[PDB]
Amino acid sequence: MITFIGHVSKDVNVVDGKREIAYGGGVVMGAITSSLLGVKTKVITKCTREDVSKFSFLRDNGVEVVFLKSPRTTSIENRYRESFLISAADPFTESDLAFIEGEAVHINPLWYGEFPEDLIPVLRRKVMFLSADAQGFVRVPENEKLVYRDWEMKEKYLKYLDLFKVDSREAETLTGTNDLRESCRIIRSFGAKIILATHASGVIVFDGNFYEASFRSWSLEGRTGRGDTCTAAFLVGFVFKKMSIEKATKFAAAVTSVKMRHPGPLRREDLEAISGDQY
Ligand SMILES: O[C@H]1[C@H](O)[C@@H](O)[C@H](O)[C@@H](O)[C@H]1O
């Protein structure tokens, strides 16, 4: 089993000045992927009681969800890649981790402060395989605008993580370099045992050696949730299906590719468009 911990979000997507609402967040995209890939999946999240029915579809995709109490629901405005934290559910606290079970937990936050760094060592004691998304540690609200800032305590906390996920913009923020491979080498030197890096054309996994796989389909409206889908697929392949790291990398790319053909989370039919020849 895998547990995803993170805020759900009312996304306000603004396309050429047109507002369109989507009910998402990183945990939605990742949890649906792992569940549809056949791994028992749990989500620990927060939102208002009134908004719980917006996220009921997690359960229809096989995901067990703990909807913890919050007086607000996270809402992020995305302008088209500029995002703003309009409203914020309450952060996670230590006691929210009390029931943690299963082999794997992915720390999947939308904004720095959602998942206080103090929770990292606490959670480490409870789980065999612990991963986190850099978005939760570098994307910082500043008069709402989510700005990219270096994660000051990265060298303290990266040693706690079996896997660390970044995308291009995160990796550059952490390292000063837009060379993605080199940033992987730098982030490894900070304590990261395995780094999963997504970028426009594909995914790079680095554990001392590089493994790469390219995406083979895409759409503009399907690109949101790329990285969360890819992370969840990699965790499924590597942690639960016992694929080699090279094979899990190709698998993660393959699953992400088919999800990117449409808006919203992975769909079961997407999996039929993968060939086993790929990975
Ligand atoms: O990865 C994206 C990104 O964090 C967006 O800014 C957020 O609004 C979406 O919920 C998330 O899925």
Numbering used by the authors: 1 to 80, 87 to 285
Structure paper excerpt:
Here, we identify a PPi-dependent kinase belonging to the ribokinase family, which is distinct from the families of the previously reported PPi-dependent kinases. Accordingly, the phosphate donor specificity of TM0415 was investigated using myo-inositol as the acceptor. This analysis demonstrated that TM0415 utilizes PPi but neither ATP nor ADP to generate myo-inositol monophosphate. Structural comparison and sequence alignment with ATP-dependent or ADP-dependent members of the ribokinase family reveal the importance of five residues: two large hydrophobic residues occluding a part of the ATP-binding pocket and three basic residues specifically involved in PPi recognition. In general, the overall structure of the ribokinase family enzymes is divided into two domains: the phosphate-acceptor-binding domain (the N-terminal half) and the donor-binding domain (the C-terminal half).
We thus also determined the SO42–-complex structure, which possesses only the sulfate ions and myo-inositol in both molecules in an asymmetric unit. The sulfate ion is well superimposed on the distal phosphoryl group of PCP in a protein molecule that crystallographically corresponds to the PCP-bound chain described above. The contribution of R229 to the reaction was confirmed by the fact that an R229A mutant exhibited only 7% of the level of the wild-type activity.
